[PDB]
Structure 1
């Protein structure tokens, strides 16, 4: 949103596809526990943000999501993320040893070029399916609002901003030890 008040302008199909392909690749990386490569997709100025969400009466609805300087499920810079990667490369990281089985269905991908050259505002919808141990099953859905920046890498993009808009007030799982 701000950006998405107006139905996005049509884009070249190879752009739509370039971006969709990015996300599919990114999902394969996460889903296949290729964390090292996934972190490489994070731009140096990465801002990885997932606001807490609350049940509000519809007049009060402007206060649904936690704001700028307010507690949140995640709100990480590159340094905080580095530490997190360092966790999921430990045989002593119990929440991911044994590892979760995750799936990221990605759809509803909408693209708007941003002010800067080679940057894009994206809205996509997801379901994340997290299965672990014998019988533990968690199903999340939401929206990812990203800012992507073009890149000399083999992937073609780096993730500058990510805002995960979860469809949950209370988190219905015992943790959030994977990445959206």
Structure 2
């Protein structure tokens, strides 16, 4: 995972706006626990991936992220995301019953065209603020690398791929019961 390879000519003002608004809408769905509405955004071939990140000497910097055949925090398909949505909406799903209060602050949206029409590669930054129970606070920061396809839904896009690069080695939270 190198620096995002942004195009030299930046996406037009309207596309930039469309994609930022999509993310703003997605964050509203997540921060208001609209879990089924959010899951409808996931394409049947979704790869939803959050690799492990480690402390390496500069000499060994290529080993910073876990690989495709390694463990990860998330490595999910449509089928496995569905199990999680079933859990998070469950009365017996203790981790989110009572539910947490989250904020997804989204910025640094960089838009890039792909070889396929209406399919975009998107880079963005976020801070996920999670408040839980009486006094629990977990702050996450990172970037998302998405593949988005235009779609005839209330949001204008669907998610084809998502990778989350989290700024953490050891997770400071007791869990990741939220969605990125």
CA distance in 2, matches of 1:8, 1:101: 39
Cα deviation, residue 138, structure 1: 0.4
- Quick check: 1:53 aligned with 2:53? yes
Matched with 1:176 is: 176
Matched with 1:76 is: 76
Q: Indicate conservation of the 8 Å contact 1:3/1:121, yes or no.
A: no
What CA RMSD, in Å, does the superposition of the two structures yield over aligned residues? 1.3
Deviation string, structure 1 residues 42-84 (Cα, Å, up to 9, x no partner): 1111100000000000110111010111110000000000111
Matched with 2:104 is: 104
Q: Indicate conservation of the 8 Å contact 2:6/2:111, yes or no.
A: no
| Structure 2: runs of 5 or more not aligned | none
CA distance in 2, matches of 1:8, 1:22: 23
Matched with 1:67 is: 67
| Structure 1: runs of 5 or more not aligned | none
Q: Indicate conservation of the 8 Å contact 2:6/2:112, yes or no.
A: no
Runs of 4+ off more than 6 Å: none
Write out aligned runs for 1:1-180 (5 A). Answer: 4-6=4-6, 8-180=8-180
TM-score (norm 2): 0.96
TM-score (norm 1): 0.96
Deviation string, structure 1 residues 95-141 (Cα, Å, up to 9, x no partner): 00000100000000000011111100000000000000000000000
Deviation string, structure 1 residues 135-178 (Cα, Å, up to 9, x no partner): 00000000000000111222111101100000000000000001
